[PDB]
């Protein structure tokens, strides 16, 4: 009866999360059983719809990691249905202003703190009778920062009480800032932008996460003091594994 | 043409992928790599018929030959998969001549076999001239994974209508009384594997093998295996994730 990422935080440690773009329950469970604190299901840059995400949330919870979802859009009703289906973390794209951050916050809390609609099918089963007492704590919410405008409005975004923090998408930020969308970009303007966001978030007493294409990049970000680090998409890890298997098999 | 049969016709073996995770995106992604075929496992996986059908499309688009390892050597199940554009069949637990003939039956139209005619997806690939070339378009391998199959290898290899045999080394090791470890070094198992290969080659038939690693597969290819699989998606993904976590946590 605790959110595994909040459990990390409450002991002053970061969380490490997986990242799924392939639908299905078997790899979800299997990866959740690894040394991940959470597994994010990507519903934006994937073919995963609601019908496919629902059983995946169950698998992840059984494997023993906190089920997260990066949604397709910052839409309150979408987020509500996922929370009611047992998503216990939400990463919302394209949060560029304070109003949009407030929109995210509105979906995560019941009245009076937000406007979340009441019908917690799966959380009521996990947390039982004492759910509603602690409902806000059970969920982690992060606003994605991935545009020049978000960067400009970082302080007003972090002013919003009902979100835990922000989540950096480095590749989308590189592309928005006029650069190539490299995996794990180290383009200097982007490195500076990210460093800045991390500072402002910590200064405001908020959490800061970041998407990572690799183990090596995650290690750096963890060393830099990021609170929530994802590494690495299941599809990318599998393709690179298969390429290496083939190279080894066809070698002289 | 069937890409695996093309390999064989040009004197070279085939390397194949191996899928136990349902879905089309990784099926297409892995098919675009330097695999000649990708096998969809329908036995030791949650992949049902509804899930396999779009995956065969995805593999074909990516440009490998879609193969299936069926749940069972059942003719009507195989016929429905061929009709859905499985162009390779690996049937488990083929232990006798009789069972190998049952496999053959499913792969060829009368008078050579008793395949029912209704080739939804192959007729789209091959057009109106499909029937005259249908047998060629499909590859059929009988699995050798028991002591019984080992004993009856020559009688199994005698059957017209199958291209050869596919060794299931973990099941074979288990049935021989050893641990079901992939890419095993256990001497009795290694010897049985070499024996089946020798018998198949002497009978002018093809031999495949399931591999857990590229390093093992390189050896199998060097030994003359016609059809080498390496390595299951779930196994590879799991090892990749474990290494990423170790690298991130500086373990
Ligand atoms: Br394996
Ligand atoms: K659906
Ligand atoms: K875990
Ligand atoms: K290919
Ligand atoms: Mn984006
Ligand atoms: Mn087997
Ligand atoms: Mn078996």
Residue numbers in the entry:
A (entry chain B): 0 to 251
B (entry chain A): 1 to 251
Q: What's the paper's own text on this?
A:
Holo‐SwHKA forms a trimer of homodimers, in which each monomer adopts an (α/β)8 triosephosphate isomerase (TIM) barrel fold. In total, holo‐SwHKA contains six equivalent active sites; each of which is formed from amino acids from two different domain‐swapped dimers.
SwHKA displays activity both with Mn2+ and Mg2+. Conversely, a square pyramidal coordination sphere at 2.4 Å distance from M2+ R constitutes the catalytically active state of holo‐SwHKA. Here, the coordination sphere no longer includes residue S116′, but only consists of E145, D171 next to three water molecules (M2+ A). Thermodynamics, therefore, favor a square‐pyramidal coordination geometry for M2+ A,W, which promotes substrate binding by providing a free coordination site.
